[PDB]
DNA sequence: TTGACTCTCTTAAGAGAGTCA
DNA sequence: TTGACTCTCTTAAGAGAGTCA
């Protein structure tokens, strides 16, 4: 088992490779018809990706490192979170983009929290719109808005009541 | 099956057994401090289901129909919306549970629309606390709230700013 | 020890189709 | 014809683990 201090090195040499990568500045929605920005620090889009880091899939990474000749591998987004509890509730805890922005590995764009709590951010109304997450969101979500849905609710006959 | 008349009368058949269902009264809340009453009328939890009614998932049944000596089958909350678009900017359009009850199948409780909508209305704050749905929520979200993060955005070093 | 690939799995909102009697 | 079971698949937010040099 890895220390806290081997735990503490994992995390420094994870944020010195992400540090590095590039980093793009995107205008986005806060909510209330207001606009802010963020600063993504955003994996390549193909190899090399930078030391320690290798695509499992379209857009999953992973996060490797072999200590005392025993290889670690984690998702590339939990390594912020080593040092965190793992479940909450009886749900185990995944990381979350404030930014929704899967390339992104900025720690300051992520937070550690259930896969609901993680999904329902994409429709939050977001900090300037009325936002309730006590970790707040960062912008408003993708998915926010009126929606488009194709049919409402209806009856042919009577044999229903709302 | 193919034509309109008798696709208009399988809804039919479908009202007339699923307004037999056991109504179940439900108060929910609605956001804003305010609770409301719906009526669902669920399925029952073990065969019989009803007429044409058979249980393929532990939450998932299907209709069937024998139109022109051929069976026709369909997941049981997609009937009413035999007539509509199966489609919607390129996305499946699906059922969707404007009560957050899936044994419930009144159709004035059901929507059609894309499986996006569908789960982003999980954490709608509801037709009193703020819902933008165009076609409105019945109820607020059973997931909407504060949530639960275990650990928010953070960094060790100084290499990130939001 | 490291990079660049490969594969399958989880969750909770949803689906389609076959085997018997 | 109708009923009561069986099985796997879709999506988009997320994961773990093997192989080879
Ligand atoms: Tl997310
Ligand atoms: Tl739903
Ligand atoms: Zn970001
Ligand atoms: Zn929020
Ligand atoms: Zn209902
Ligand atoms: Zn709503």
């Given at each position: 088992a890895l220390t806290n201090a081997q735990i503490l090195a994992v995390i420094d040499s994870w944020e010195e490779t992400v540090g590095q990568f590039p980093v793009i500045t995107h205008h986005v929605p806060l909510g209330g018809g207001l606009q802010g920005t963020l600063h993504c620090y955003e994996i390549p889009?193909?190899?090399?990706?930078?030391?320690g880091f290798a695509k499992n899939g379209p857009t999953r990474w992973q996060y490797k490192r072999t200590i005392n000749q025993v290889v670690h591998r984690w998702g590339s987004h939990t390594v912020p979170f080593?040092?965190?509890?793992?479940?909450?509730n009886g749900k185990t805890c995944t990381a979350s983009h404030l930014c929704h922005n899967?390339?992104?590995?900025n720690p300051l764009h992520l937070c550690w929290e259930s896969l609901d709590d993680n999904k329902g951010r994409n429709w939050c109304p977001g900090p300037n719109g009325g936002c309730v997450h006590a970790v707040v969101?960062?912008?408003?979500?993708?998915?926010?808005?009126?929606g488009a849905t194709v049919a409402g609710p209806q009856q042919r006959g009577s044999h229903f009541v709302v």
């Open positions: 889009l193909a190899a090399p990706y930078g030391v080593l040092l965190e509890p793992d479940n909450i899967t390339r992104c590995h969101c960062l912008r408003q979500g993708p998915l926010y808005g009126p």
